[PDB]
Amino acid sequence: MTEYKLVVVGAGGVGKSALTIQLIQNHFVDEFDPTIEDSYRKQVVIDGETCLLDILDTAGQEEYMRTGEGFLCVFAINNTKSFEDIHQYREQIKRVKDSDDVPMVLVGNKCDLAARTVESRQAQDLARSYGIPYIETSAKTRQGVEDAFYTLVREIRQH
Ligand SMILES: Nc1nc2c(ncn2[C@@H]2O[C@H](COP(=O)(O)OP(=O)(O)NP(=O)(O)O)[C@@H](O)[C@H]2O)c(=O)[nH]1
Ligand SMILES: [Ca+2]
Numbered sequence: 001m002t003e004y005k006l007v008v009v010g011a012g013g014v015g016k017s018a019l020t021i022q023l024i025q026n027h028f029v030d031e032f033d034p035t036i037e038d039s040y041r042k043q044v045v046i047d048g049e050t051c052l053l054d055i056l057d058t059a060g061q062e063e064y065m066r067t068g069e070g071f072l073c074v075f076a077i078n079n080t081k082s083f084e085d086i087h088q089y090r091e092q093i094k095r096v097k098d099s100d101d102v103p104m105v106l107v108g109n110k111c112d113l114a115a116r117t118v119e120s121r122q123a124q125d126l127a128r129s130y131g132i133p134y135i136e137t138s139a140k141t142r143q144g145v146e147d148a149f150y151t152l153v154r155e156i157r158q159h
């Protein structure tokens, strides 16, 4: 059956692991270990297609992807530095993949928190400059989580 190899990248502590665990295990982790590299595999139904999601959860911490088919580029809406650092991760992707045309979604996580320091308009403008969708998420409330992963699946489908 069809398998979508997704890779989740972004700065440390933005909620990459929490988002992944919320999609795959359907619960929120309040306290998680920084990642070296972890992978999750799950059979799902998306738009009437039964498929398998292989998600690679990568390290955000600097102390640390090529087979990836689609990329979730994650920042946290209450972490300006993570947003300012997004261009880096897009660059490495275009680099390792050898393409300016790679399925990718920009994700603004922790949208449940009220200490927003990155405005939606700014992230939208960035996403449009890359030619990609922008989706805001909360791994805590599950807001936008399916939207983000499923949009990525659909971007891979269109490619
Ligand atoms: N309120 C809230 N907290 C969140 C959300 N996502 C993650 N967190 C919290 O943020 C912390 C770090 O999340 P984590 O998933 O470990 O981040 P990471 O990007 O995987 N880290 P690393 O890059 O080091 O592997 C955890 O305490 C987690 O509960 C979210 O959407 N909302
Ligand atoms: Ca595939």
Ligand SMILES: [Mg+2]
Pocket (backbone or CB within 6 Å): 016, 017, 018, 033, 034, 035, 057, 058, 059, 060
């Ligand atoms: Mg992690």
